[PDB]
Amino acid sequence: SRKKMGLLVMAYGTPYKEEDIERYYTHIRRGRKPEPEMLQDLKDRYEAIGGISPLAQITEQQAHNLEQHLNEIQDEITFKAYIGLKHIEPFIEDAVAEMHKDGITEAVSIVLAPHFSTFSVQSYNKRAKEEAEKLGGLTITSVESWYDEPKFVTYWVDRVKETYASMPEDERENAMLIVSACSLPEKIKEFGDPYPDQLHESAKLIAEGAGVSEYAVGWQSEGNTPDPWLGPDVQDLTRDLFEQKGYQAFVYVPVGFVADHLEVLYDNDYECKVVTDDIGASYYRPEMPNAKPEFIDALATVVLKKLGR
């Protein structure tokens, strides 16, 4: 009695083992293979954050718990998850072709990044649909943004509340909340990309929910191209904020990310930590959503809402 639907879960992608780093970054660098020194630096970074293998496992866990959870909370549809990545197989095109081969005719997609952007989400979505259209007999409704889903906001609000609650009294009264997302070229402003505004909206929502009056918006993990990227970078923001008001503790909420990947374990837990340690403030960075039940339910709701259910 259930209708069969494909669940297309897309993400940036992560290497599966150390030997994948080269091709992973070459693909990210659009064909430019990292020099030996960079390659070694990269390996060291991954090793320092606890190894690579756990990383890719997270996306897989998220896709499968989501699939099982959606299949459990409603009884009209039976979902089958398919992972489509941007920088490593299984690629988006691959995930779609396989859905087509398994007989899927109807699908719903969602990108494992809460804020819409012309650079990523729109691109992932456009590519998934074009492949489908190329194969035929398969349609896809795509979620474009979900940073505003209440369950998702509540997840970060409560993690923030716990973090501040755990702080000493003097730290609780002199802390700064830095909410961030992956940086992108400023040029996206040319198309009226709402990415920046959406991140600011995420920050306002989480801070308001958590009762935090002092907070700021920053960006991190930008790439390296001649064209200016969205700023300020979380590193400069932290030091700048400290130099002007002397906060004793910084709370980092990389709302743009959904799992324990390199951008959070290193770019936050290491790079921002270097700065807070340097200035003498306390470093705090709440648990990322990953595959926790609360997160999965929020995503399930996002998908069901998209389908009018």
From Swiss-Prot:
The protein's role, per its UniProt record: Involved in coproporphyrin-dependent heme b biosynthesis. Catalyzes the insertion of ferrous iron into coproporphyrin III to form Fe-coproporphyrin III. It can also insert iron into protoporphyrin IX. Has weaker activity with 2,4 disulfonate, deuteroporphyrin and 2,4 hydroxyethyl. In vitro, can also use Zn(2+) or Cu(2+).
Effect of gene knockout: Deletion mutant requires hemin for growth.
Effect of residue 263 to V: Retains less than 1% of activity
Resulting phenotype, residue 12 to M: Changes the metal specificity of the enzyme. Can insert Co(2+) into protoporphyrin IX at a higher rate than the wild-type enzyme, but loses the ability to insert Cu(2+) and Zn(2+)
The protein's Enzyme Commission number: 4.99.1.9
Organism: Bacillus subtilis (strain 168)
pH dependence: Optimum pH is 7.2 with Zn(2+) and protoporphyrin IX as substrates.
Enzyme class: lyase
UniProt: N-methylmesoporphyrin binding residues: 12, 30-32, 182, 187
Residues that bind Fe(2+): 182, 263
UniProt xrefs under InterPro entries: Ferrochelatase, Ferrochelatase_AS, Ferrochelatase_C, Ferrochelatase_N
Protein name, entry field: Coproporphyrin III ferrochelatase
Pathway: Porphyrin-containing compound metabolism; protoheme biosynthesis
Annotated catalysed reactions: Fe-coproporphyrin III + 2 H(+) = coproporphyrin III + Fe(2+)
